[PDB]
Curated annotation (Swiss-Prot):
UniProt disease link: Glioma: Gliomas are benign or malignant central nervous system neoplasms derived from glial cells. They comprise astrocytomas and glioblastoma multiforme that are derived from astrocytes, oligodendrogliomas derived from oligodendrocytes and ependymomas derived from ependymocytes.
Subunit structure: Interacts with LGALS3. Binds SFTPD and SPAR in a calcium-dependent manner.
Tissue specificity field: Highly expressed in alveolar and macrophage tissues. In some macrophages, expression is seen on the membrane, and in other macrophages, strongly expressed in the phagosome/phagolysosome compartments. Expressed in lung, trachea, salivary gland, small intestine and stomach. In pancreas, expressed in certain cells of the islets of Langerhans. In digestive tract, confined to tissues with large epithelial surfaces. In intestinal tissue, moderately expressed in epithelial cells of the midcrypts and the crypt base.
Family to which the UniProt record says this protein belongs: Belongs to the DMBT1 family.
Induction: Up-regulated in intestinal epithelial cells in response to pro-inflammatory stimuli including TNF and bacterial lipopolysaccharides (LPS).
Domain SRCR, first and last residues per copy: 11-111
Subcellular localization(s) per the UniProt record: Secreted
Post-translational modification as stated in the protein's UniProt record: Highly N- and O-glycosylated. The O-glycans are heavily sulfated.
Part of the full-length chain shown: 1242 to 1354 of 2413
UniProt superkingdom: Eukaryota
Domain characteristics, as noted in the entry: The SRCR domains mediate binding to bacteria. The minimal bacterial-binding site is an 11-residue repeat of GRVEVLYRGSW where VEVL and W are critical residues.
The protein's name: Scavenger receptor cysteine-rich domain-containing protein DMBT1
Gene for this chain: DMBT1
Cysteine pairings via disulfide bonds: 36-100, 49-110, 80-90
Length: 114
């Protein structure tokens, strides 16, 4: 990952009750995209929760549980071991390499969420 994208990458959870649950969105090339729910699981969620300082994964809802996003779908088939420090450190399909719709946008509920 080039130094420049590494500097600008960012993760957020949107449309939930607080910052520690919601639809997963990732900042790629200066635009916020969503993550497809294919093979999305608590291991992926766990990386997200820990990265955000949100504790550990409670659950990893697919099927746009927190609503459909509108950006590009930037991540798909995410295969986190659960140990990685950043979601972009997980194996995945490649940026923008998806076969999804926004009705599949992945979500997370973390243990620090209230
Ligand atoms: Ca799916
Ligand atoms: Ca996974
Ligand atoms: Ca897929």
């Amino acid at each position: 990952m080039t130094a420049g994208s590494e500097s600008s990458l960012a993760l957020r959870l949107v449309n939930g009750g607080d910052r520690c649950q919601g639809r997963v969105e990732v900042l790629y090339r200066g635009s916020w995209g969503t993550v497809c729910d294919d093979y999305w699981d608590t291991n992926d969620a766990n990386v997200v929760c820990r990265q955000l300082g949100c504790g550990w994964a409670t659950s990893a809802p697919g099927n746009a549980r927190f609503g459909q996003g509108s950006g590009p779908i930037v991540l798909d088939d995410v295969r986190c071991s659960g140990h990685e420090s950043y979601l972009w450190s997980c194996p995945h399909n490649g940026w923008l390499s998806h076969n999804c719709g926004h009705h599949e946008d992945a979500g997370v509920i973390c243990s620090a969420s209230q």
